[PDB]
Amino acid sequence: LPKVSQSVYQMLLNEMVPLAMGIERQISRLKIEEHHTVDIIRSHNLIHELYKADEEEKEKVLARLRNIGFQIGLKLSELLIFSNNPNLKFKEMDLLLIMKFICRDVWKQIFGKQIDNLKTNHRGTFYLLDYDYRPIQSFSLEEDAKNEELKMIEPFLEIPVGIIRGVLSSLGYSSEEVICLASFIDRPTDRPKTAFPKGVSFHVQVT
Amino acid sequence: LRPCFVSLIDESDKPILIYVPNEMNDVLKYNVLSNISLDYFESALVEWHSLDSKPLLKSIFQLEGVSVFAMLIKQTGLKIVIGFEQKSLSGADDEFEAINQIFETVRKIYIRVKCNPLLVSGDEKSIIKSLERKFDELFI
Amino acid sequence: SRSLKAMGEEIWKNKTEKINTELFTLTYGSIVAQLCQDYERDFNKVNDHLYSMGYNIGCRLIEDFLARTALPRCENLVKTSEVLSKCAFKIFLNITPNITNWSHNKDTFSLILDENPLADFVELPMDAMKSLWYSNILCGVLKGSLEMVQLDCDVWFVSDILRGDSQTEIKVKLNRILKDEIPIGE
Amino acid sequence: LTAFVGAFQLIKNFIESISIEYRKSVRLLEFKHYFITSMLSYFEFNPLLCEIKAELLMLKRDNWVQGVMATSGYRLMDKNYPNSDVKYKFDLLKETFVDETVFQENFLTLTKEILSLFNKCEGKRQRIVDILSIEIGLLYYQGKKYEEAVSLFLSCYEYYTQTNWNSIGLKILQVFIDSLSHCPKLDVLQIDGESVSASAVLTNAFLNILKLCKDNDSKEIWWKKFMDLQNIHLMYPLDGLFEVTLNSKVHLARANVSAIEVNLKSYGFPEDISTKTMRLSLKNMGGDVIVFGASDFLLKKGENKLILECRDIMYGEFSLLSFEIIVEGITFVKEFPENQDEFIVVPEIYCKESTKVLVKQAHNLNLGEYALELKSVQSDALESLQVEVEVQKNNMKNLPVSFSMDEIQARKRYNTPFENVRLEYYLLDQIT
Numbered sequence: 012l013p014k015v016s017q018s019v020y021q022m023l024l025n026e027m028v029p030l031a032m033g034i035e036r037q038i039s040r041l042k043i044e045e046h047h048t049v050d051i052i053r054s055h056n057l058i059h060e061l062y063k064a065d066e067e068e069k070e071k072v073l074a075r076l077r078n079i080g081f082q083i084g085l086k087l088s089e090l091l092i093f094s095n096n097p098n099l100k101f102k103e104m105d106l107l108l109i110m111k112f113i114c115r116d117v118w119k120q121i122f123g124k125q126i127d128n129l130k131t132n133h134r135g136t137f138y139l140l141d142y143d144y145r146p147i148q149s150f151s152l153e154e155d156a157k158n159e160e161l162k163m164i165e166p167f168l169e170i171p172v173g174i175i176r177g178v179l180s181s182l183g184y185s186s187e188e189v190i191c192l193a194s195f196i197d198r199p200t201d202r203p204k205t206a207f208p209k210g211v212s213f214h215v216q217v218t
Numbered sequence: 219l220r221p222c223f224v225s226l227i228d229e230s231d232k233p234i235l236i237y238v239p240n241e242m243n244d245v246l247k248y249n250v251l252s253n254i255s256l257d258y259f260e261s262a263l264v265e266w267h268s269l270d271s272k273p274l275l276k277s278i279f280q281l282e283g284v285s286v287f288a289m290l291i292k293q294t295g296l297k298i299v300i301g302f303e304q305k306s307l308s309g310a311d312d313e314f315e316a317i318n319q320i321f322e323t324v325r326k327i328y329i330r331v332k333c334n335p336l337l338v339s340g341d342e343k344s345i346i347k348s349l350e351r352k353f354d355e356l357f358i
Numbered sequence: 359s360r361s362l363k364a365m366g367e368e369i370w371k372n373k374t375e376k377i378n379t380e381l382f383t384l385t386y387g388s389i390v391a392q393l394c395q396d397y398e399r400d401f402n403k404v405n406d407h408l409y410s411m412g413y414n415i416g417c418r419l420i421e422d423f424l425a426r427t428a429l430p431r432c433e434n435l436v437k438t439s440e441v442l443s444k445c446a447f448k449i450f451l452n453i454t455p456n457i458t459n460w461s462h463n464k465d466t467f468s469l470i471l472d473e474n475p476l477a478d479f480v481e482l483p484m485d486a487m488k489s490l491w492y493s494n495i496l497c498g499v500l501k502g503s504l505e506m507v508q509l510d511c512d513v514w515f516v517s518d519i520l521r522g523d524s525q526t527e528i529k530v531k532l533n534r535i536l537k538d539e540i541p542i543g544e
Numbered sequence: 545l546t547a548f549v550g551a552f553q554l555i556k557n558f559i560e561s562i563s564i565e566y567r568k569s570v571r572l573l574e575f576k577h578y579f580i581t582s583m584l585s586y587f588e589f590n591p592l593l594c595e596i597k598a599e600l601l602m603l604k605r606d607n608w609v610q611g612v613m614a615t616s617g618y619r620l621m622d623k624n625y626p627n628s629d630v631k632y633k634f635d636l637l638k639e640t641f642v643d644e645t646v647f648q649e650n651f652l653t654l655t656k657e658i659l660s661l662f663n664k665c666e667g668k669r670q671r672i673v674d675i676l677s678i679e680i681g682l683l684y685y686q687g688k689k690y691e692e693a694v695s696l697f698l699s700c701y702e703y704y705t706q707t708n709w710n711s712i713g714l715k716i717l718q719v720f721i722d723s724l725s726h727c728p729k730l731d732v733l734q735i736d737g738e739s740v741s742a743s744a745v746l747t748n749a750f751l752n753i754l755k756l757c758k759d760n761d762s763k764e765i766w767w768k769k770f771m772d773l774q775n776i777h778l779m780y781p782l783d784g785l786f787e788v789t790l791n792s793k794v795h796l797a798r799a800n801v802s803a804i805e806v807n808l809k810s811y812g813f814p815e816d817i818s819t820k821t822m823r824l825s826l827k828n829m830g831g832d833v834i835v836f837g838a839s840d841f842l843l844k845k846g847e848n849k850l851i852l853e854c855r856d857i858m859y860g861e862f863s864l865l866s867f868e869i870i871v872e873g874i875t876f877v878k879e880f881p882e883n884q885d886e887f888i889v890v891p892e893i894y895c896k897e898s899t900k901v902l903v904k905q906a907h908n909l910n911l912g913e914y915a916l917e918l919k920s921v922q923s924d925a926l927e928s929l930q931v932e933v934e935v936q937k938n939n940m941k942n943l944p945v946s947f948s949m950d951e952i953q954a955r956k957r958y959n960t961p962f963e964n965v966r967l968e969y970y971l972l973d974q975i976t
């Protein structure tokens with residue numbers, strides 16, 4: 012079956028925060044393509060601009076990238092249901108089976124590795140813990156400025172949240188009862204020290 | 219082994235599309251058959267697959283010279299129901315598998331058209347036209 | 359050393375990870391869909407923003423293509439066309455564009471996309487049938503890559519199967535071979 | 545119970561197989577009907593029990609109607625069948641269909657029995673119940689017993705048009721309208737309570753078929769049947785017959801009237817309509833409201849752009865509230881949504897040949913004697929004019945003015961024209 016290179020995919024999947032930030036500039040470096048002078052701006056410039064723009068524009072870009080991830084997850088859902096053919100139902104009240112499916116197949120198809128262990132409230136919310144989080148395994152600023160790194164690298168945590176939201180959509184629960192938040196609160200228990208120090212945690216709320 | 223009508227219904231019993239592959243009152247009859255058919259998915263008369271994680275096919279009923287077959291997609295709530303004639307069937311396993319092959323072909327068409335990343339959010343006027351174009355392209 | 363054929367198959371078979379092309383198509387489709395969505399369907403110059411997208415992508419992809427292939431700096435249009443046609447696409451997208459429509463005195467040529475994984479399944483709306491390109495990122499990436507290989511080219515789309523034309527063609531006309539810089543020590 | 549179901553898939557698969565394989569046999573239906581009625585003999589004591597019996601007897605009656613239609617040719621309503629060249633002789637039961645009269649009654653009896661059996665299946669199966677009920681309705685319509693048909697259809701008056709079953713809606717509505725039309729009086733009917741008027745239900749059904757049916761130009765029959773036949777003021781959810789867009793924005797049209805041009809695509813009706821009055825409402829952020837309306841307009845068939853004039857205007861920002869058309873008898877309304885942030889402004893357009901009142905602080909005055917001056921540009925000939933001036937409270941509980949030294953007056957309404965007049969003023973405490 013046809014394939015495409017993981018490197019170009021990983022880079023493209025990384026690079027929407029500059030897209031989601033520059034679209035805002037166009038809504039609210041000169042050069043000529045053929046006859047008319049278009050303007051282009053770098054990626055790290057827009058990452059820093061998002062880091063220090065202001066709160067409402069930051070929230071707008073966060074919801075922007077959440078919409079992108081929602082589309083991706085919702086739209087890849089039907090493909091995964093066709094191909095893998097799991098044992099789910101349309102609105103299964105057993106959230107554990109849905110979360111097992113997302114942990115086993117969706118992430119195996121998007122990223123290269125199965126997601127790590129998960130908590131089980133059995134009543135309300137769930138936690139999804141990822142270690143070393145492939146797309147941003149090669150990000151950094153400085154030897155000392157680690158505090159700014161985690162605050163600047165925040166919006167890149169949205170596209171998997173959007174993926175989870177979208178996969179839950181078109182599988183029963185809509186985007187009015189479900190909310191999810193990403194964070195770095197996961198700590199490396201005993202794993203080998205990779206480039207990025209902190210794993211990520213997706214806290215998923217479903218009533 | 220042409221189909222007399224093809225019906226796609228979503229989770230909410232909103233009929234997505236009840237195409238007839240061209241009498242002036244035929245779409246009427248096929249709609250009545252489809253509406254009668256849509257109930258059996260929530261019926262204890264026949265046990266659905268619930269095994270091996272595969273869409274399982276059954277012959278649901280048959281009225282007034284139209285053999286109607288159906289699929290419930292467990293993991294999405296999509297419902298496919300398409301008809302066939304008495305006078306174009308033999309009933310052996312080879313045809314029972316060929317009609318199944320037609321079923322996956324139809325579901326490919328629906329996936330492809332709904333998967334087009336230019337549908338704005340929910341435009342039924344666009345979805346219906348695209349599905350109708352694909353069905354015309356196939357059955358002709 | 360070895361032919362570009364052997365190089366392309368060797369690098370593609372055993373020196374790169376893989377994913378399903380459907381998922382890459384899905385991602386790029388999501389990008390273009392939302393750019394259509396949040397921009398009042400201004401197809402006249404959503405293409406410009408997609409060009410900026412593609413340029414920013416390609417300028418930093420070239421560092422990886424050269425990292426794997428390790429070819430010398432291309433000098434003439436013949437070798438640039440050969441390498442782009444034969445290995446540059448084969449590493450990433452696993453396709454082999456065909457080259458025809460050679461211009462006068464070897465200053466321009468055309469990439470024919472026989473199969474476009476970026477558009478495995480699309481039916482554009484009626485208003486887009488003569489406005490949008492949907493694959494501007496590809497030529498943007500090409501120009502960005504050639505910028506870092508230090509040869510400037512005007513690259514644009516002549517035709518697309520999506521709009522209705524018979525085949526998808528990308529003219530890649532060179533403009534000038536800008537030279538290396540020197541220290542400005544007086 | 546587990547035996548009963550498995551027996552039913554067994555018999556259903558067997559009848560399927562024997563029907564498909566035993567073809568060309570002239571005695572097929574003869575065998576099949578007696579087979580069905582014999583096989584039915586074992587279930588006689590649950591919801592599943594009633595379901596199975598009803599389904600089997602439904603198969604029975606369907607084969608029955610197939611046989612009688614093939615051997616007799618009398619169409620039952622309109623359900624046509626594949627015209628097989630080979631002839632089938634279903635003649636051993638030539639008692640229920642020797643005549644076309646008792647035939648319909650017998651089929652009605654079978655349908656009613658099946659309806660009862662399905663209705664005794666708790667509540668897990670309503671669809672075939674509803675379809676069968678409308679089959680009884682069509683049988684009554686064919687039998688020309690419209691009094692019962694209209695009463696039966698009053699239940700499912702409008703069920704299959706919001707569920708996107710447009711063809712089913714088209715049949716049920718057209719037959720309902722026809723049945724209501726032919727019989728003379730039918731002057732009082734009730735749906736689920738107080739009797740709704742015959743005119744109201746009739747025009748509701750007519751407008752529903754007009755908005756639902758789409759046949760380019762052959763709905764002219766329904767158009768003529770509406771405008772030749774038959775009031776109470778009635779509102780409606782406009783969406784379906786007309787679509788409205790805001791072309792451009794406000795501009796001057798005449799001396800002292802703002803005007804806004806708008807285009808509307810009309811395709812609910814096939815021919816032209818003389819609307820007596822049209823009105824667009826633009827709500828204000830504070831809460832105020834205004835109206836734009838141009839009356840006695842012949843709406844062209846298709847797409848047309850017209851200018852709406854306004855008389856009373858409050859300069860500022862507005863959000864559109866509701867659009868409306870008043871046809872002779874009916875008032876279509878389309879209420880726009882709320883919190884759009886797509887506000888349209890109404891700027892202070894100024895013209896030479898237009899009457900206006902100007903208010904300002906007085907030019908010449910004494911110290912500590914505050915006042916105001918009112919002018920009137922182009923006072924000229926004016927039949928009448930009244931100007932009302934009042935103050936807004938600011939502490940949100942103050943009123944920093946009195947037009948007197950005794951009472952706290954905050955208004956003085958004129959009744960006569962003026963070229964220039966000096967209004968008086970007295971500050972309360974300190975306001976700037």
Ligand SMILES: *C(=O)CCCCCCCCCCCCCCC
Nearest residue numbers: 423431432441446450499503507
């Ligand atoms: C001399 O060495 C010239 C080398 C040719 C430049 C390499 C071009 C790399 C870019 C190919 C297209 C990548 C796919 C973009 C779509 C996402």
